[PDB]
From a paper:
Furthermore, we reveal distinct dimerization states of unmodified and neddylated CRL2FEM1B to uncover the NEDD8-mediated activation mechanism of CRL2FEM1B.
Although most of the identified FEM1B C-degrons bearing substrates contain a proline at the C-terminus, some of them, including CUX1, do not end with a proline. To understand how the C-degron of CUX1 is recognized by FEM1B, we further solved the cryo-EM structure of unCRL2FEM1B with CUX1. The CRL2FEM1B-CUX1 dimera and dimers were solved at resolutions of 3.38 Å and 3.27 Å, respectively. Two head-to-tail juxtaposed CUL2-RBX1 dimers wrap around the FEM1B homodimer interface to stabilize the architecture.
Residue numbers in the entry:
A (entry chain G): 17 to 112
B (entry chain J): 22 to 104
C (entry chain C): 246 to 744
D (entry chain B): 472 to 627
E (entry chain A): 1 to 116, 135 to 162
């Protein structure tokens, strides 16, 4: 229940599977030829996503899983000006 | 016997062989994908071939617009230089 | 029953009551209708075809028999229409017959048969069957006939065809052409005939050629009209290059008059099918070196990187005979002009004397001499008409120039039909090379496949071009076997492996 | 569907969907006003089933969602408003798309009922948050991102 | 490497992708690394510079699918007596293959097809199966 989203740098980013399945191309990546019936690592290796933006993607996973049934003044997600336009693409690729 | 008029043909090819502009996937000696449609308003003659230092040929538009946002040669990921 | 069902029943049963009364009188007797659709389409009974299409559309398995039998009828009509063509005007008659069959069977489908997409697909299949129709154990005739149709239509014709003629006939030719399933042969024939039209100025108008190239581009992508459009652009920029050459010669540090003219036709090496086939070791004549060296300097200093390989066999020249009495002006080819300069320093010439001057091999010098002497400009000084060492030829002083335009260029001006088989062989060789490269890529990518699956893959990536014959793909597999690139698997010959 | 593919627009840029979700559509006073009440859930659902451009705009950029969220009777006609919002979100509508005044449909919703209906129908997305950050920081997104993202930050 | 719209030659990335989408529609073995990299290949094709190759990718995927169920159909009716069990084997392979290839083509489905008359690859593969293997064989299949 803990996938391991590799970054292009090489940083393992072990996150709970419930969090990582909110994506489109991470739920799709762990479906088919890669399923890990042995559930040993669940590598979702990204050779395109930088580490500094995949960290924010994982933080978004946690933030969305937490602040989903709230509807009452959710705190802002602090996208830095420099990491934006790199996190827009990294969220378009993974389908948010 | 002296002659007054002569005409001739001659095949020409680049010293290093290259066929297609890698960006727009048209020919380097053809118009780029931009001014091919804009062949009337524009001159449709300034679209010359631009030669990188890595012996790669693209249209001048197709590499000038590529270099406006990124800094890399498109085919092989290296720094460019107009030779 | 549809009207009556509204009057009485609930709307929810508007469908079942009609559907259940279809599956009693149009589907219980479906085979009966299916036993007679043939006749309905063989006589093209418009009312009956319309009624039968309306009837069988509701039935699940009723329509496909009508589709297949309409395809059979259109195929038989195309075979009976495009197989009795006279050999005189065959290029126009083939295209016109396929065009009229297409028009008739799209007017029938669109109005009587409501223009169903399946019926149009059946029409397309039948017309593809009749267009790519060949004699037993014979090559296809569609590409050559359609390429000759375009060549005769786009050339300078004496019938006074208007611009609307090439604007409409070519537009309908695109519809006729889209059914050729062997498009590479047509592409190469159109390239060859377009080259022969462009180099000799035989084309009706460059705008018409550009329109035709654009139409073929819209039909079959950009890779089809790559070489053709490059050739057209070369011919369009040749005039600007000649003007630039005039500017260069008039802008030199020392003023230089060319003497001879220079209407240069620069051509791209890759695009044009014109290739330096023979040795062509023809030394440039002395009167032409002044222009040749200057143009080499101009093309090396103004466009650096473009090596200019001269083709000293396609170049014409306006030659005059001052010793004969200066009669009019004569146009010959450069490929023999040097021996004409021999007549400048000796009224009689020998093959040994000519060999040092023109420097080219005599295997074509003899035929150039023959094409010179048939107009009686140069007569046979000796008696031995056969190819001998001495073989004297003299200048026929009694025969003057018959016309002002003494044209010997007509040997190259007209495109000979003897080169059709050579172009066929070139197409075949390029086809083998392309299929070899594609199958090498496939084998290095997959490395595991079956033979029938290999044929399916070969036709899958050959969809974009000519279709390959099964025996041809088998021969390609054989030549891969004897090229140390593919080998028979140990388990069976069906499996193939890449090393 | 023929007219929907034709894409008709009024003088204010209203498409068929915008009028079908607008309460300010002038219904005729003779007999149509006794039956045809706009906005109507059925007409909008049918337009969406016929392929209406859900993410259309007015002259001032208001989509169908911006138009519906300003509805004046969210209590008595809660069925209609709820069904319109459900259909618009299901057919695909950016619940934070910004008009020319940079107002999300939540910012345009006058009533709290429509606000909370949309919030129930709103799905959080990192693409929208990153696009909002890009627009707020005015980062140059020309050719740096796909064209799809080039318009995604266009209306976010 | 990055997610920015770059220029990709279609005949190379598609050739690398075809050996995978041939081997996942047949339920052959493609490892986790290759299957993950094909997602980046699909993305790079769908946002290629300057012309997005999503339309060409969809066209060639449809052509490959109609050249696969056609091959499966030719494999089906040649075994006339056992067309039921052969159809069941090939359908059991092809249903999971279509689902897996729909998973692989998620970016093309949700960023090109839904924007544009076009069927998603999960829907397209089944629709290619119905029009080329069920409907041609509906006379023999339902009879047996
Ligand atoms: Zn270009
Ligand atoms: Zn240009
Ligand atoms: Zn380069």
């Amino acid at each position: 229940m803990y996938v391991k989203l590799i970054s292009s740098d090489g940083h393992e980013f072990i996150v709970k599977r419930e969090h990582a399945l909110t994506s489109g191309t991470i739920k799709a990546m762990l479906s088919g030829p890669g399923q890990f019936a042995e559930n040993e690592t669940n590598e979702v290796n990204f050779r395109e996503i930088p580490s500094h933006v995949l960290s924010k993607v994982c933080m978004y996973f946690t933030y969305k899983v937490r602040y989903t049934n709230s509807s009452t003044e959710i705190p802002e997600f602090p996208i830095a000006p420099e990491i934006a336009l790199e996190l827009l693409m990294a969220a378009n690729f993974l389908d948010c | 016997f002296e002659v007054k008029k002569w005409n001739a043909v001659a095949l020409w090819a680049w010293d290093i062989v290259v066929d297609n502009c890698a960006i727009c996937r048209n020919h380097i000696m053809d118009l780029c994908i931009e001014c091919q449609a804009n062949q009337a308003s524009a001159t449709s003659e300034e679209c010359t071939v631009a030669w990188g230092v890595c012996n790669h040929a693209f249209h001048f538009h197709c590499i000038s617009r590529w270099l406006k946002t990124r800094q890399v040669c498109p085919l092989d990921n290296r720094e460019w230089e107009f030779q | 029953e549809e009207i009556r069902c509204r009057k009485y029943l609930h709307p929810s049963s508007y469908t079942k009551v009609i559907h259940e009364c279809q599956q009693r009188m149009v589907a219980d007797h479906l085979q009966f209708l299916h036993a007679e659709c043939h006749n309905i389409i063989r006589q093209e009974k418009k009312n009956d075809m319309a009624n039968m299409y309306v009837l069988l559309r509701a039935v699940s398995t009723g329509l496909p028999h009508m589709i297949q039998e309409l395809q059979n009828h259109i195929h038989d009509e195309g075979l009976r229409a495009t197989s009795n063509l006279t050999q005189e005007n065959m290029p126009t008659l083939f295209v016109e017959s396929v065009l009229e069959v297409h028009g008739k069977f799209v007017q029938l489908i669109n109005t009587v048969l409501n223009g169903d997409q399946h019926f149009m697909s059946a029409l397309d299949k039948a017309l593809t069957s009749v267009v790519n129709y060949r004699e037993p154990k014979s090559v296809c005739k569609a590409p050559e006939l359609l390429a000759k149709y375009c060549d005769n239509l786009l050339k300078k014709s004496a019938k006074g065809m208007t611009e609307n003629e090439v604007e409409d006939r070519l537009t309908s030719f695109i519809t006729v052409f889209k059914y050729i399933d062997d498009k590479d042969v047509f592409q190469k024939f159109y390239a060859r005939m377009l080259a022969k039209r462009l180099i000799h100025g035989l084309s009706m108008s460059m705008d018409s050629e550009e329109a035709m190239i654009n139409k073929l581009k819209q039909a079959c992508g950009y890779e089809f009209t790559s070489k053709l459009h490059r050739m057209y652009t070369d011919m369009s920029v040749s005039a600007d290059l000649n003007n630039k050459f005039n500017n260069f010669i008039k802008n030199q540090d020392t003023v230089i008059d060319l003497g001879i003219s220079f209407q240069i036709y620069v051509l791209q090496a890759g695009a044009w099918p014109l290739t330096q086939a023979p040795s062509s070791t023809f030394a440039i004549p002395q009167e032409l070196e002044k222009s040749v060296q200057m143009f080499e300097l101009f093309y090396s200093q103004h466009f650096s990187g473009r090596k200019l390989t001269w083709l000293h066999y396609l170049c014409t020249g306006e030659v005059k005979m001052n010793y004969l009495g200066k009669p009019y002006v004569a146009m010959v080819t450069t490929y023999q002009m040097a021996v004409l300069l021999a007549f400048n320093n000796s009224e009689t010439v020998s093959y040994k004397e000519l060999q040092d001057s023109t420097q080219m091999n005599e295997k074509e010098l003899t035929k150039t001499i023959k094409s010179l002497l048939d107009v009686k400009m140069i007569n046979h000084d000796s008696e031995k008409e056969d190819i001998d060492a001495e073989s004297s030829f003299s200048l026929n002083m009694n025969f003057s120039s018959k016309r002002t335009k003494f044209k010997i260029t007509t040997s190259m001006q007209k495109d000979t039909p003897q080169e059709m088989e050579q172009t066929r062989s070139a197409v075949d060789e390029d086809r083998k090379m392309y299929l070899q490269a594609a199958i090498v890529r496939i084998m290095k990518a997959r490395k595991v496949l079956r033979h029938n699956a290999l044929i399916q893959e070969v036709i899958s990536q050959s969809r974009a071009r000519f279709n390959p014959s099964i025996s041809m793909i088998k021969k390609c597999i054989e030549v891969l076997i004897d090229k140390q690139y593919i080998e028979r698997s140990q388990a069976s010959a069906d499996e193939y492996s890449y090393v | 569907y023929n007219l929907i593919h034709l894409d008709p627009r009024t003088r204010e840029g209203f498409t068929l969907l915008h009028l079908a979700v607008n309460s300010n559509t002038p219904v005729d006073d003779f007999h149509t006003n006794d039956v045809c009440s706009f906005p109507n859930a059925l007409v909008t659902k049918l337009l969406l089933d016929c392929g209406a451009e859900v993410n259309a705009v007015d002259n001032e950029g208001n989509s169908a969602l911006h138009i519906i969220v300003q509805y004046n009777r969210p209590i008595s006609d809660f069925l209609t408003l709820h069904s319109i919002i459900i259909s618009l979100v299901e057919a695909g509508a950016h619940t934070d798309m910004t008009n020319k005044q940079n107002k999300t449909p939540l910012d345009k919703s006058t009533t709290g009922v429509s606000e909370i209906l949309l919030k129930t129908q709103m799905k959080m997305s990192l693409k929208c948050l990153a696009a909002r950050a890009v627009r707020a920081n005015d980062i140059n997104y020309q050719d740096q991102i796909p064209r799809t993202l080039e318009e995604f930050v266009g209306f976010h | 490497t990055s997610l920015k719209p770059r220029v990709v030659d279609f005949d190379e990335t598609w050739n690398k992708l075809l050996t995978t989408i041939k081997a996942v529609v047949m339920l052959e073995y493609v490892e986790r690394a290759t299957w993950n990299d094909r997602f980046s290949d699909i993305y790079a094709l769908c946002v290629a510079y300057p012309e997005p190759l999503g339309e060409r990718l969809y066209t060639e995927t449809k052509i490959f699918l109609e050249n696969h169920v056609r091959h499966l159909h030719k494999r089906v009716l040649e075994s006339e007596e056992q067309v039921l069990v052969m159809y069941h084997r090939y359908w059991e392979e092809y249903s999971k293959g279509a689902d897996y290839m729909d998973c692989l083509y998620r970016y093309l489905n949700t960023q090109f097809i839904k924007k544009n008359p076009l069927m998603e690859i999960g829907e397209l593969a089944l629709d290619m199966w119905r029009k080329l293997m069920v409907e041609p064989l509906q006379a023999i299949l339902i009879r047996m």
